[PDB]
Enzyme design. Structure first.
Site, mmCIF file in Angstrom:
data_model
loop_
_atom_site.group_PDB
_atom_site.id
_atom_site.type_symbol
_atom_site.label_atom_id
_atom_site.label_comp_id
_atom_site.label_asym_id
_atom_site.label_seq_id
_atom_site.Cartn_x
_atom_site.Cartn_y
_atom_site.Cartn_z
ATOM 1 N N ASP B 59 0.814 -1.241 0.000
ATOM 2 C CA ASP B 59 0.000 0.000 0.000
ATOM 3 C C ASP B 59 0.841 1.282 0.000
ATOM 4 O O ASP B 59 1.819 1.381 0.753
ATOM 5 C CB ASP B 59 -0.881 0.090 1.262
ATOM 6 C CG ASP B 59 -1.830 -1.102 1.459
ATOM 7 O OD1 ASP B 59 -1.636 -2.166 0.851
ATOM 8 O OD2 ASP B 59 -2.774 -0.965 2.290
ATOM 9 N N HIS B 61 -1.070 4.541 -0.465
ATOM 10 C CA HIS B 61 -2.083 5.440 0.085
ATOM 11 C C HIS B 61 -1.727 6.938 -0.051
ATOM 12 O O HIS B 61 -1.683 7.646 0.946
ATOM 13 C CB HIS B 61 -2.407 5.068 1.547
ATOM 14 C CG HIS B 61 -3.319 3.899 1.660
ATOM 15 N ND1 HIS B 61 -4.573 3.885 1.091
ATOM 16 C CD2 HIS B 61 -3.145 2.681 2.227
ATOM 17 C CE1 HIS B 61 -5.136 2.713 1.318
ATOM 18 N NE2 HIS B 61 -4.284 1.961 1.988
ATOM 19 N N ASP B 87 -4.074 -0.210 -3.544
ATOM 20 C CA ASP B 87 -4.214 0.881 -2.552
ATOM 21 C C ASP B 87 -3.242 2.053 -2.772
ATOM 22 O O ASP B 87 -2.369 2.361 -1.922
ATOM 23 C CB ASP B 87 -4.112 0.328 -1.142
ATOM 24 C CG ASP B 87 -5.386 -0.342 -0.682
ATOM 25 O OD1 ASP B 87 -6.317 -0.581 -1.488
ATOM 26 O OD2 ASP B 87 -5.437 -0.653 0.515
ATOM 27 N N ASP B 90 -6.180 7.412 -1.262
ATOM 28 C CA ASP B 90 -6.816 7.596 0.059
ATOM 29 C C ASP B 90 -5.787 7.751 1.148
ATOM 30 O O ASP B 90 -4.658 7.327 0.986
ATOM 31 C CB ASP B 90 -7.763 6.452 0.451
ATOM 32 C CG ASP B 90 -8.980 6.385 -0.415
ATOM 33 O OD1 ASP B 90 -9.300 7.433 -1.017
ATOM 34 O OD2 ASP B 90 -9.631 5.293 -0.463
ATOM 35 N N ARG B 91 -6.208 8.368 2.250
ATOM 36 C CA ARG B 91 -5.456 8.527 3.499
ATOM 37 C C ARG B 91 -4.373 9.572 3.394
ATOM 38 O O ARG B 91 -4.412 10.549 4.133
ATOM 39 C CB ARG B 91 -4.938 7.190 4.102
ATOM 40 C CG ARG B 91 -5.975 6.069 4.198
ATOM 41 C CD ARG B 91 -6.703 6.012 5.536
ATOM 42 N NE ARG B 91 -7.621 7.138 5.688
ATOM 43 C CZ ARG B 91 -8.390 7.370 6.750
ATOM 44 N NH1 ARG B 91 -8.384 6.542 7.794
ATOM 45 N NH2 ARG B 91 -9.169 8.451 6.754
ATOM 46 N N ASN B 119 -8.450 -2.634 -2.461
ATOM 47 C CA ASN B 119 -9.805 -2.281 -2.062
ATOM 48 C C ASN B 119 -10.115 -0.790 -2.098
ATOM 49 O O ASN B 119 -11.271 -0.405 -2.105
ATOM 50 C CB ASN B 119 -10.184 -2.906 -0.711
ATOM 51 C CG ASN B 119 -9.378 -2.376 0.439
ATOM 52 O OD1 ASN B 119 -8.142 -2.424 0.424
ATOM 53 N ND2 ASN B 119 -10.076 -1.906 1.490
ATOM 54 N N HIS B 120 -9.072 0.043 -2.135
ATOM 55 C CA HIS B 120 -9.257 1.477 -2.267
ATOM 56 C C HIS B 120 -9.383 1.919 -3.721
ATOM 57 O O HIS B 120 -9.681 3.085 -3.984
ATOM 58 C CB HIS B 120 -8.165 2.239 -1.508
ATOM 59 C CG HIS B 120 -8.310 2.126 -0.020
ATOM 60 N ND1 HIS B 120 -8.807 3.151 0.759
ATOM 61 C CD2 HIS B 120 -8.098 1.085 0.819
ATOM 62 C CE1 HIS B 120 -8.870 2.753 2.017
ATOM 63 N NE2 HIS B 120 -8.433 1.507 2.080
ATOM 64 N N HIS B 168 -4.047 -8.315 -3.432
ATOM 65 C CA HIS B 168 -4.141 -7.282 -2.394
ATOM 66 C C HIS B 168 -4.530 -7.818 -1.022
ATOM 67 O O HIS B 168 -3.804 -7.618 -0.051
ATOM 68 C CB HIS B 168 -5.118 -6.178 -2.779
ATOM 69 C CG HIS B 168 -5.099 -5.049 -1.815
ATOM 70 N ND1 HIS B 168 -4.023 -4.203 -1.714
ATOM 71 C CD2 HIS B 168 -5.983 -4.667 -0.864
ATOM 72 C CE1 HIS B 168 -4.246 -3.339 -0.747
ATOM 73 N NE2 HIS B 168 -5.434 -3.591 -0.223
ATOM 74 N N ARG B 216 -13.441 -5.993 9.553
ATOM 75 C CA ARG B 216 -13.728 -4.913 8.590
ATOM 76 C C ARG B 216 -15.200 -4.797 8.177
ATOM 77 O O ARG B 216 -15.607 -3.769 7.624
ATOM 78 C CB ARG B 216 -12.864 -5.049 7.336
ATOM 79 C CG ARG B 216 -11.380 -5.026 7.586
ATOM 80 C CD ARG B 216 -10.637 -5.348 6.300
ATOM 81 N NE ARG B 216 -9.200 -5.557 6.507
ATOM 82 C CZ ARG B 216 -8.265 -4.623 6.400
ATOM 83 N NH1 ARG B 216 -8.587 -3.382 6.091
ATOM 84 N NH2 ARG B 216 -7.003 -4.936 6.592
ATOM 85 N N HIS B 243 -2.405 -4.766 2.147
ATOM 86 C CA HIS B 243 -3.740 -4.528 2.750
ATOM 87 C C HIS B 243 -3.733 -4.180 4.254
ATOM 88 O O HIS B 243 -4.592 -3.436 4.721
ATOM 89 C CB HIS B 243 -4.670 -5.709 2.378
ATOM 90 C CG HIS B 243 -6.114 -5.567 2.756
ATOM 91 N ND1 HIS B 243 -6.885 -4.472 2.426
ATOM 92 C CD2 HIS B 243 -6.959 -6.456 3.323
ATOM 93 C CE1 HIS B 243 -8.126 -4.667 2.831
ATOM 94 N NE2 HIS B 243 -8.201 -5.868 3.371
HETATM 95 MN MN MN Z 1 -6.354 -2.588 1.337
HETATM 96 MN MN MN Z 2 -4.611 -0.113 2.526
#
Ligand code: MN
Ligand code: MN
Lengths: 7, 293
Positions: B59, B61, B87, B90-91, B119-120, B168, B216, B243
């Site tokens: 990731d 991010h 990923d 995001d973040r 997943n992002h 992922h 989650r 992940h």
């Molecule tokens: Mn993830």
């Molecule tokens: Mn992630």
């Protein structure tokens, strides 16, 4: 712990 | 039409600037990256079959200056081959430069640079977790939707020299053979639970031996026996996944039959974790390069 979707 | 070499130069121009400094590309250059890489994604298999030597990253991010540091340590493309496990957005504060750089290298070097779906890279997640907001702030919502159409075409898994299975999230109780992955149809969102959802979302757990419930709110956990059964059925040595935020940047699970990679140091500004990249050399030997918080 940052919010479970994720520490 | 599109100047790939000039997009990359402008993206790499901020090497050694104050971290957080933006590269404000034109909207039509970004749209160009999305549409050209999408065509490249669709022409390549959904299950990638890759060969060493290869650097594998988890990731990012949107930590763009940490992506630049990964390239510093590993060699900027085409000096090394790369597999990213998803990923990208995001973040972090610079999802746009991050994904633009990765998409630009994918167009430039489509047989030496590879990106998996995380997943992002799903509209429903990146709407909440920062990427929609970054797009609205710096460009517009229509460009956010153009990225959605690009993310829907990303491949989902990779097998490196018939031995390392990469994705992922992790495994699925629905996953019986590799052929099952192979005619998941693209473009696709992830509209239901099931195989593709699990590959993006599932987690190892030391305290389940079979299949368990995921905290989650989606997909499953899997234990060591699941991993063992899967590797032996498909004649593999290792699951490489991402992940999950890990302290050392990499962490072994299931009796070292799985490794988690996280390539974003000091995640969110708040955790004190390191980042890691996995180098698989030409004789299928693995090493880890650590990036300090
Ligand atoms: Mn993830
Ligand atoms: Mn992630």
């Amino acid at each position: 712990x940052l919010x479970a979707x994720x520490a | 039409k599109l100047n790939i070499d000039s997009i990359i130069q402008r993206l790499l121009e901020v090497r050694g600037s104050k971290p957080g400094k933006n590269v404000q590309l034109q909207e039509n250059e970004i749209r160009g990256l999305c549409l050209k890489s999408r065509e490249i994604f669709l022409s390549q298999p959904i299950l990638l079959e890759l060969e060493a030597p290869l650097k594998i990253c988890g990731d990012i991010h949107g930590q763009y200056y940490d992506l630049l540091r990964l390239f510093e340590y590993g060699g900027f493309p085409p000096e090394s081959n790369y597999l990213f496990l998803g990923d990208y957005v995001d973040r972090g504060k610079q999802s746009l430069e991050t994904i633009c750089l990765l998409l630009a290298y994918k167009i430039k070097y489509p047989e030496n640079f590879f990106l998996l779906r995380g997943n992002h890279e799903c509209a429903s997640i990146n709407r909440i977790y920062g990427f929609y907001d970054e797009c609205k702030r710096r460009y517009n919502i229509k460009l956010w939707k153009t990225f959605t159409d690009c993310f829907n075409c990303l491949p989902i898994a990779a097998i490196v020299d018939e031995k390392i299975f990469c994705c992922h999230g992790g495994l699925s109780p629905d996953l019986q053979s590799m052929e099952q992955i192979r005619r998941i149809m693209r473009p696709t969102d992830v509209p239901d639970q099931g195989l593709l959802c699990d590959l993006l979302w599932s987690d190892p757990d030391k305290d389940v031996l079979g299949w368990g419930e995921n905290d989650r709110g989606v997909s499953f956990t899997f234990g060591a026996e699941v991993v063992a059964k899967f590797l032996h059925k498909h004649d593999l040595d290792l699951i490489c996944r991402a992940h999950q935020v890990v302290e050392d940047g990499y962490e072994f699970f299931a009796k070292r039959q799985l490794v988690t990679l996280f390539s974003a140091p000091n995640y969110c500004g708040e955790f004190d974790n390191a980042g890691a990249m996995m180098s698989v050399d030409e004789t299928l030997m693995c090493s880890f390069q650590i990036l300090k918080p």
